[PDB]
Amino acid sequence: SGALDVLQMKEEDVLKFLAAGTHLGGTNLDFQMEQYIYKRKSDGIYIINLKRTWEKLLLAARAIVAIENPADVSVISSRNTGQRAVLKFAAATGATPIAGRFTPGTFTNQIQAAFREPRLLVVTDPRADHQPLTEASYVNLPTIALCNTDSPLRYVDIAIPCNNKGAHSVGLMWWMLAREVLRMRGTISREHPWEVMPDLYFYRDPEEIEKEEQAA
């Protein structure tokens, strides 16, 4: 971002984006996501441009560090592949997590016990999580969304282009968001690698934890 060379992409970040499958989008295109695709392959997959992913991710990290209080940035994940990344990001940065089922009224019903009033909203996937995206329209929330190529851009303000479908690329995108916020705010220096692996943010399947528990 910023036309600055300290904030540019390095080859280590690009090897993570290549190895996770962030650049492999979907097979359909919502018509205002086509400023992010490079080209469509013979397979039918659209390729997400990674520089647009990086500049929208750094603009999202600028929007996340711009709140003085870290406790009223709230992160939503309803699908199962982003719950552990939301809980790890919320333990890392000090945000508030909402993982799992999002009971409606938690931004507009004042007398229910889970009534919050955050100042920004980061969601996992803007089609499956459209219930807090619609409930952001009565409370004046700007909304940041990790967006696939086939995902509707109603009521989101900052769309971070990725493959939000797989486990690896969701866990990586929440990891890169945590890393850019903690470097920008001042916690980690820019020159060392961050000591937290992205495998702390990945999804652990019940079949995957049972194959890890029975060792050879």
Added chain:
Amino acid sequence: VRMNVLADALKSINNAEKRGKRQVLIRPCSKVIVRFLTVMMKHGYIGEFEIIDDHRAGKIVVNLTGRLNKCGVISPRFDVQLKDLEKWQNNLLPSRQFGFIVLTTSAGIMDHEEARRKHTGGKILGFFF
């Protein structure tokens, strides 16, 4: 078929302004529309524009900052004498403080307050406010 080209141009401006778009493309291009959009530009309502020259009747690409609530046409062009100008600016305009009626007079195409200051009347073309 297509009659009264200025009307269909101003309906193009209005439909693409109500959606908050930033640039329109007007076709055809009269010399009526270039003086009309000169009048709306000089009051600070649309900003710059371009007259695209093919060797047929050209196109016009207008910049838009939305400042423009309504841009309309009056068809047919009724003869407005100088005593009928207050009856016409009471009908079409939203206020005594703003809004303009463009009318085509023998000193040129001009708005309705300049036609009182130049002491002339003529046929009406439309309005913008």
Added chain:
Amino acid sequence: PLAKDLLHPSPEEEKRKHKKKRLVQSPNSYFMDVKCPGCYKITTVFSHAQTVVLCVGCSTVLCQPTGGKARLTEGCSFRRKQ
């Protein structure tokens, strides 16, 4: 969209559109010269020609009228002029 520039269109979206719907309309035909391989008349054909263009050495046909582009006879050689 909705910030979209109409005064500077890209050539991908200027070869995309219909020939009447560009900023300046411009035809999608071109002028060829057909070389017949056993004679030395360079012969000038339209791309979309509607008559059978007869050459004057060995009186052969160069091109066939079809609904679109004229299918040149197979084994001649062509290039676009200009």
Added chain:
Amino acid sequence: RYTNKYSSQFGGGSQYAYFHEEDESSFQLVD
């Protein structure tokens, strides 16, 4: 080196010579 054995030294004429005006690779061939 080899082509410098085959030129003439005073004998130059091109009256038996054929100048091609369309010698090019610019033509495509139609299938």
Added chain:
Amino acid sequence: MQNDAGEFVDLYVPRKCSASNRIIGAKDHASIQMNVAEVDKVTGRFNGQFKTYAICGAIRRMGESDDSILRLAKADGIVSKN
């Protein structure tokens, strides 16, 4: 607004959109005001100064808030020029 003694007689002056310049009313409950933080050019850390953009809710409802945030951040030196 302003009467002949020079007084400003209005109750308040409402915000306007950064994307469409429509008046964000009192009850446009879907409109946002978003801060986007600046960084220092030598270290890449947040130094306290802001960029502020406001979008009315009617632009947000049709899916056009993202592209206008991208254009407004591009023109004030946050997004690169590629």
Added chain:
Amino acid sequence: GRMHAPGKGLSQSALPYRRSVPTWLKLTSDDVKEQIYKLAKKGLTPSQIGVILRDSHGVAQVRFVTGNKILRILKSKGLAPDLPEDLYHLIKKAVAVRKHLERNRKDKDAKFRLILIESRIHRLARYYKTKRVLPPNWKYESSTASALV
């Protein structure tokens, strides 16, 4: 859309911006005019002369190289057809439809197509009498079908 059909189709030939004779076009104005004369001696209308010079001689637009049009060139030599071309083809199609309809009187739709073609003939004749290309006593009468052409 079209005049006597419900169709709204858009199919035209769109002339380019650049109005100039090209660098390879070696036919001068006088050579193009003599090509037009020896092509119009074979019985040809303006349209077929325009087709032949487009296809086989490489002049795209004849009024771009000479400076004036094909029918001005044919009328300045007395080779102009006496009826115009379009009115000739509409009259010839009307004689063809009436020659079909003298045998088949259960042909309820070709009678209707005769009504449309004769309407287009009267619209062109009423245009041409106001540009004085025709005499003002020109009446198209259905007895006078094979007396015209």
